[model samples]
Target: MKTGIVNVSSSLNVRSSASTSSKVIGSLSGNTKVTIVGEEGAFYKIEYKGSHGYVAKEYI
Candidate 1:
């Protein structure tokens, strides 16, 4: 149940996969709390809405 606060000034895109090329399913704004459920490459697998997506590690 690890968590991270979104660090970007604007927003961080939550993708369908670990890569930036993945689909943009959602996003998180600065200081928002995000659940870290897993990781892949340089991304963090986060739970949002009723689903999940991968956000870049640098922005979380």
Candidate 2:
């Protein structure tokens, strides 16, 4: 995977798991850069602020 920038007008949720029902561990502001490390279904595993989390693919 490659690094991507958040394109949403609002912040994107960084979930602890790959699903939207999972806990929100953090968030990415619009235009923030993220390093995509992996994928699970419709989500992308990413590294942000030194922690690993998942964001919706559509938001990247």
Candidate 3:
């Protein structure tokens, strides 16, 4: 499912090798555009900028 951007921030807990460190990437803000990739329980894996991260659906 497609979603929107909010706030761009790196994941504090890196559980995957694809995790980023300090790259000021674009994130969904207010009503920014986004696209859902995968689902992980309470978090929905989504695409932000050119990378993927987990975002709570409540924010969207």
Candidate 4:
């Protein structure tokens, strides 16, 4: 699919899998924008640099 861009929040957290629980790949800065990549059956996924973030809220 094509890529997507989003103005993510400063509290945005990226995870390796889904939770981002401590094992948070990292936090999204107030940079340019958040890139969207893929999705799941019932979940939303975002791509930044090369990481896939399973977002639970505040995404569009």
Candidate 5:
């Protein structure tokens, strides 16, 4: 799949699930590149470190 650039004004949280209440699995700083694997609601599923995680779509 084509990669996405993290376009947040600051660091973006990578969550274990699609919701804000989900565990914080990692983070991506602004301008970082990512691979979008899927979509759930307002979130984009992505590969972080090796496992799957999610970030808000508005920040992509």
Candidate 6:
């Protein structure tokens, strides 16, 4: 699935948490291209610029 970046300081976590504990492989600008891996609740698990993470639907 195709997705887009909402925040440049986006995060990817083992869980759906957005806290600082999550690993930030890199940054993503708004509307950046992403490949969705899956979905969890209101979050969309996606890969962007070689980094995978969950972004809120509001960002899409």
Top TM-score: which candidate number? Answer: 2
| Minimal lDDT window, size 10, model 1 | 5-14
TM-score of each: 0.73, 0.75, 0.48, 0.45, 0.74, 0.51
- Candidate 2 per-residue lDDT over residues 1-60, each given as its tens digit: 557777767656678876667878676667777776778988877776777777778755
**Where is model 6 more than 4 Å wrong at Cα?**
1-26
Cα-based lDDT for every prediction: 0.71, 0.73, 0.51, 0.55, 0.73, 0.57
Tens-digit lDDT string for candidate 3 (1-60): 545565455433312223344343443444556676767655567655566655565544
Higher-lDDT candidate of 3 and 6 = 6
Better of 1 and 2 by TM-score: 2
Clashes of 4: 0
> What TM-score would you give candidate 5 relative to the actual structure?
0.74
TM-score, cand. 6: 0.51
Please identify which of the two predictions, 4 or 5, would achieve the higher lDDT against the true structure.
Answer: 5
Which residue pairs in candidate 5 have backbone atoms (N, alpha carbon, C) closer than 3 angstroms, thus clashing? Answer: none
Native-referenced Cα lDDT, model 5: 0.73
Tens-digit lDDT track of model 5 for 1-60: 668877758556678776778778676667767677779988887776667777778755
Residue-by-residue lDDT tens digits, candidate 4, 1-60: 554554555565555564445376667554435555566633466666566566554454
| Pairs of residues at least 3 apart in sequence or in different chains that clash in candidate 4 | none
Displacement of the residue 22 alpha carbon in candidate 3, Å: 14
Off by over 4 Å in 2: none
